[PDB]
């Protein structure tokens, strides 16, 4: 008996769009939290990188195997019911991911393993690996969570854009696509910010070795809070959207205005035949594949590039790459949508516009390479430690005294402008710590040094972290990355607008699924293998003494990595340019044939 | 007799590239605004 | 190489200030008187 | 009590504003000119500020009556806007003195200076409202013929402002590390350019700048002085002379 | 384009409002930077550098303004009315960038004369009123 004007306004198209923005925002937040949660889980819980790759590919293959089936299901049934079911499965997924971080928080603690480790011994706390037991259950939980996450998240990005395509005019389709992409982007930002504001240790960062144990407790506690909050929000959104009627009044009015003036396997095969016969769709699909490949490569590579070239600490480098890939991206998406919406862009003009954007992006990438051709301060790789020992003298008496592990070696900076790996191996057996800075005392394995330094209460103080004297190229590179992100995010909206034009209204549901299958299978499966091959080509000097099977390198060759990644990016962009220059002629031929003026 | 003086000066960081980043952000935004106005006038010159 | 056993504790002077090198005479038990003479200052190594 | 109250207020406002306001403002002016008067305040200082508070209470009663009066057209009068502003600062400083306690400096402070200059435009507004009668037609016509050419003199003062600001910028720029101690900041700069514009010891500026190592700054100051002097003074003199000259040509 | 573009950007009120806003913002900012160039406010030092570089951006806006002037009659504009004086003043205001990029201004820089030249050009290109114009015509005759 709800005949309220609140309902009569909530069934409007803007009412649907508000909850779609909220759902895309919470999906982006959950995905951004989940990715770095899996990364820190793999870093902390004593596993190998191949398993991280496996449970990262599990989400992608689940999305691939759910996309076509959910497009086929929504092509015949109500999209709202499937969206609500996906949101319900999403809310279940968030709690299923939260459960291991609260039930199984005693897998690998600092000292809480009282059965096989004792407090008075330091060596016995890092051996007798009972953490490997009760970890396979967590692996099963995480792989199931990734599977249900893909199965519950994909249909959304399919059916919401299907709703936009089938019940919004093209004058606002670009705006809705742009604000949906911006909602996903700001969800990524907000999720990473909430994750990194709690996973990072409190201002008591530099206390005694109960600090890793309390950080280990705190990060799982924070994930347990955040995932239940996300699950409650998703369940509330699902329940609110369930109350929405199937027959939308605004959609029915639009259909009545536009009326004037069985998905069978054979129909599926005919549709695939039409898709393969029209080469515009193939060109746009490969262009989207290359754009996604370039975006993912840049996102995965920029923090590592900052560590190896600008000496940017991992989390700070990832924070920089995140927090400065969004302001360009959201503005580019908004501009790309708004240009088409305000100016009523045509298909040939869209192709020319995308070609111009890709050309200027290629020029900007060339400028980025030219800037990277400049030199910078070099840390390490000084062709053996000044003649005292070889590459492999890191396991000295100074290393053996304080019991350092090679998997967490940081960079110290002496006062003679020489940077040394393993600050504890640098000879410093005393560590007195200030409130805002880490430093090392009484260093004996170090060189002469002691040039200037600075202290008040003592002396012989080696500061922690990587010292930098010429880091002014970073803001320039960040501005160039702003421009590159703008022109990369601004290319995608005209492609989707092109995709809308060539497909009739009744079949517009399956086009998004067809494109998204190539997005997640053809592009997303071999790209990490290619990235690992390039990374193995670059990181020749692996830690073969202890680390073994290529788990942690130390010498990341800046010139080789820059040259290879820029060659890959230039090849992808030139492939996009060639596809666009083919598609311009193809679309001109098709238009001339269909017009025959 | 001996004595050594260490007096602080005012040699700061140049920050020339740090502000050249702002220069590049600015004229890229100006070029984008000019391109938007360019496309708008390409839409609206056919009336005349 | 600077040190303290041969060069003494150095000054820690802040941004540009005014200093007069004023020296007094001392022997055996203690100081005798303030020194009024003609002075010359020279750096250890050489600057301009 | 709407329009009927407004018309009752109009009639009784005419009557009581002619009767009560004139005598109380005359007494306020008498006590204020006996107050300023820095020889009789020591023959006082206790019978003075009590009468100030009493007549400020009378003035805030005038403000209350004007607020309860017709409103918008009362606000439309610029003099009444000045009255409202003066009553705002009057209630502000009255409650500031009334609350006591506080945490800032006192005992004849800069805020107290601001307060007694506040009482100075209070006295000025009392003088302005006491001259409702017998303004004298000769000086009334003289003042009207003064105010006839407002746009010309405003344009000329805008020009002189732009020219002084340009001269201040160029002289502060050319005088860098040339003993700025007289004009180290913008205020003292523009004050030195005011002295240069008002013929005040710029010959002394020349003689104590010859003691410095800069000599070419003296011809620059020289030509700037003479051009701004002749141009501005001649423009204002000519404009006001002709403005009264059409009035002379008329009746 | 070209001359048509110059006419359109002169006719549009948004461009005129933007350029006059930049003009008076630059004139207001110009005297701020000369007041303090020390470590009195550490947090206000990078933003003051950014304000000086915003003035450099105003010089780049003058560069694109003379590009719009190149879009006009080009060689005919080399000998004209006070607009050619404005062009010369903008060139003299672009000159300090060159003399700090390659001149090493530890000498008689004379940057201040060009600065006051561009300041007076901004103070004259401020959409002067008709009351100013009539008295200026009286002064020139």
List keywords for this structure.
part of a larger assembly, 5 chains, A: 597 residues, mainly alpha, 3-stranded antiparallel sheet, 18 helices, 5 strands, 66% helix, globular, B: 48 residues, 0% strand, Kazal_dom_sf (chain A), cell projection (chain A), flagellum (chain A), transmembrane (chain A)
Give a nutshell description of this structure.
This is part of a larger assembly, with one copy of chain A (597 residues), two copies of chain B (48 residues), one copy of chain D (251 residues) and one copy of chain E (141 residues). By secondary structure, chain D is mainly α. Helices cover 76% and strands 0% of the residues of chain D.
First-to-last CA distance of chain A: 58 Å
Order of helices and strands of chain D: HHHHHHHHHH
Structural Rg of chain D? 26 Å
Secondary structure tally: strands of chain D: 0
What is the element string of chain A, with H for helices and E for strands? HHHHHHHHHHHHHEEEEEHHHHH
Major sheet of chain D:
none
* Pair of chains with the largest interface and how many residues each contributes: D-E, 20 and 16 residues
* Biggest sheet features of chain A: 3 strands, antiparallel
Specify the number of helices of chain A: 18
Q: Work out the number of β strands of chain A.
A: 5
Distance between the termini of chain D: 51 Å
Helix percentage range of chain A: 55-70%
Percentage beta strand of chain D: under 5%
Structural class based on helices, strands and sheet pairing of chain D = mainly alpha
- Approximate shape of chain D: extended
Rg of chain A is 27 Å
Strand order of the largest sheet of chain A: 3-4-5
Shape field of chain A: globular
Q: Level of helix content of chain D?
A: over 70%
Proportion of residues in β-strands of chain A: under 5%
Q: Helical element count of chain D?
A: 10
Subcellular location (chain A): Cell projection, Cilium, Flagellum membrane
Organism (chain A): Mus musculus
Cytoplasmic side (chain A): 72-79, 162-173, 245-281, 340-352, 497-511
Function (chain A): Auxiliary component of the CatSper complex, a complex involved in sperm cell hyperactivation.
């Amino acid at each position: 008996p709800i005949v309220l004007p609140f309902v009569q306004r909530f069934n409007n198209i803007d009412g649907f769009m508000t909850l779609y923005v909220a759902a895309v925002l919470i999906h982006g937040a959950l995905f951004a939290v989940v990715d770095m949660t899996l990364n820190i889980y793999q870093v902390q819980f004593s596993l190998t990188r191949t398993e991280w790759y496996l449970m990262d590919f599990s989400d992608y293959i689940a999305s691939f195997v759910v996309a076509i089936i959910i497009a086929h299901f929504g092509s015949k049934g109500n999209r709202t019911r499937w969206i609500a079911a996906s949101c319900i499965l999403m809310g279940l997924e968030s709690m299923l991911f939260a459960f291991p971080f609260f039930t199984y928080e005693i897998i690998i603690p600092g000292r809480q393993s009282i059965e096989l480790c004792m407090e008075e011994n330091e060596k016995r706390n890092i051996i007798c690996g009972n953490s490997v037991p009760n970890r396979s259950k967590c692996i099963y939980f995480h792989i199931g969570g990734q599977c249900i996450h893909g199965i519950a998240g994909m249909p959304i990005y399919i059916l919401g854009i299907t709703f936009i395509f089938d019940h919004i005019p093209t004058s606002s389709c670009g705006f809705y696509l742009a604000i949906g992409h911006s909602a996903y982007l700001i969800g990524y930002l907000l999720g990473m910010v909430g994750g990194l504001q709690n996973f990072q240790p409190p201002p008591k960062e530099k206390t005694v070795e109960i600090e890793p144990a309390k950080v280990y407790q705190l990060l799982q506690s924070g994930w347990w809070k955040t995932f239940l909050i996300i699950a409650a929000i998703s369940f509330c959104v699902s329940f609110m959207m369930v109350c929405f009627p199937t027959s939308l009044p605004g959609a029915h009015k639009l259909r009545l205005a536009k009326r004037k003036e069985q998905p069978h396997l054979k129909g599926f095969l005919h549709n695939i035949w039409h898709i393969l016969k029209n080469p515009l769709m193939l060109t746009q699909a490969i262009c989207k594949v290359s754009e996604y490949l370039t975006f993912n490569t840049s996102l995965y590579f920029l923090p590592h590039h900052l560590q190896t070239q600008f000496l940017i600490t991992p989390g700070i480098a990832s924070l920089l790459t995140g927090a400065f890939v969004l302001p360009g991206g959201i503005i580019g998406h908004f501009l790309g949508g708004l240009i088409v919406d305000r100016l009523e862009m045509t298909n040939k003009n869209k192709l020319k516009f995308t070609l111009v954007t890709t050309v200027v992006s290629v020029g900007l990438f060339l400028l980025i390479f030219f800037v990277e051709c400049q030199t910078t301060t070099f840390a390490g790789i000084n062709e053996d430690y000044d003649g005292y020992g070889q590459l492999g003298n890191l396991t000295a008496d100074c290393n053996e005294y304080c019991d350092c592990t090679t998997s967490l070696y940081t960079s110290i900076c002496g006062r003679d402008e020489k940077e040394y790996f393993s600050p504890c191996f640098a000879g410093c057996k005393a560590t007195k710590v200030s409130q805002t800075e880490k430093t090392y005392y009484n260093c004996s394995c170090i060189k002469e040094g002691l040039a200037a330094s600075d202290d008040e209460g003592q002396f012989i103080d080696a500061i922690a972290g990587t010292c930098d004297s010429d880091c002014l190229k970073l803001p320039l590179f960040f501005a160039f990355y702003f421009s590159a992100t703008v022109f990369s995010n601004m290319c995608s909206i005209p492609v989707i607008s092109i995709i809308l034009q060539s497909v009739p209204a009744n079949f517009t549901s399956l086009s998004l699924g067809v494109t998204y299958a190539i997005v997640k299978f053809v592009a997303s499966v071999p790209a990490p293998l290619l990235f690992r091959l390039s990374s193995a080509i670059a990181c020749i000097y692996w830690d073969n003494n202890r680390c073994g099977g290529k788990e942690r390198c130390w010498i990341y060759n800046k010139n080789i990595l820059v040259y290879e990644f820029m060659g890959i990016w230039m090849s992808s962009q030139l492939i996009i340019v060639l596809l666009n220059i083919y598609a311009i002629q193809i679309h001109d031929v098709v238009v001339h044939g269909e017009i025959t003026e | 007799t001996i004595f050594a003086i260490e007096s602080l000066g005012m040699i700061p960081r140049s920050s020339v590239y740090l502000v050249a980043a702002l220069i590049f952000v600015l004229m890229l935004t100006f070029i984008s605004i000019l391109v938007l106005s360019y496309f708008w006038y390409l839409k609206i010159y056919r009336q005349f | 190489r600077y040190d303290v056993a041969k060069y003494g504790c150095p000054l820690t002077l802040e941004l540009g200030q005014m200093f007069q090198p004023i020296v007094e005479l001392y022997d055996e038990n203690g100081f005798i008187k303030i020194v009024d003479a003609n002075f010359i200052l020279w750096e250890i190594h050489g600057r301009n | 009590l709407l329009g009927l109250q407004q018309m009752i207020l109009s009639l009784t406002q005419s009557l009581g504003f002619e009767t009560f306001i004139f005598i109380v403002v005359c007494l306020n002016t008498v006590i204020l000119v006996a107050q300023t008067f820095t020889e009789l305040e020591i023959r006082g200082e206790w019978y003075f500020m009590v009468l100030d508070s009493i007549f400020l209470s009378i003035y805030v009663l005038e403000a209350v009556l004007k607020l309860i009066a017709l409103g918008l057209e009362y606000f439309y009068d610029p003099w009444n806007n000045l009255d409202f502003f003066i009553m705002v600062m009057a209630v502000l400083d009255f409650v500031l003195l009334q609350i006591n306690s506080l945490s800032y400096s006192f005992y004849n402070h800069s805020l107290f200076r601001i307060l007694k200059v506040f009482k100075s435009m209070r006295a000025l507004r009392a003088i302005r409202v006491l001259r409702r009668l017998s303004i004298l037609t000769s000086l009334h016509e003289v003042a009207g013929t003064l105010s006839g050419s407002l746009p010309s003199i405003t344009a000329i003062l805008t020009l002189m402002f732009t020219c002084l600001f340009l001269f201040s910028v160029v002289l502060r720029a050319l005088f860098q590390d040339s003993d700025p101690k007289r004009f180290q900041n913008i205020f003292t700069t523009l004050f030195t350019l005011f002295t240069m514009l008002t013929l005040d010891d710029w010959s002394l500026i020349y003689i104590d700048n010859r003691a410095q190592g800069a000599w070419y700054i003296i011809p620059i100051l020289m030509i700037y002085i003479v051009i701004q002097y002749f141009i501005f003074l001649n423009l204002v003199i000519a404009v006001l002379v002709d403005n009264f000259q059409m009035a002379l040509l008329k009746g | 384009p070209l001359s048509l573009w110059a006419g359109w950007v002169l006719d549009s009120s948004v461009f005129s409002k933007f350029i006059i806003s930049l003009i008076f913002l630059n004139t207001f900012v110009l005297m701020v930077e000369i007041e303090l160039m020390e470590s009195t406010n550490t947090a206000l030092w990078p933003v003051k550098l950014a304000l000086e570089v915003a003035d450099w951006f105003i010089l780049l806006s003058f560069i694109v303004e003379i590009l719009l002037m190149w879009l006009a009659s080009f060689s005919l504009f080399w000998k004209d009315a006070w607009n050619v004086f404005d062009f010369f003043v903008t060139l003299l205001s672009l000159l300090p960038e060159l003399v700090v990029l390659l001149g090493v201004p530890a000498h008689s820089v004379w940057l201040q004369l060009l600065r006051v030249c561009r300041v007076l050009r901004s103070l004259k290109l401020f959409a002067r009123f008709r009351q100013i114009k009539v008295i200026l015509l009286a002064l020139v005759r």
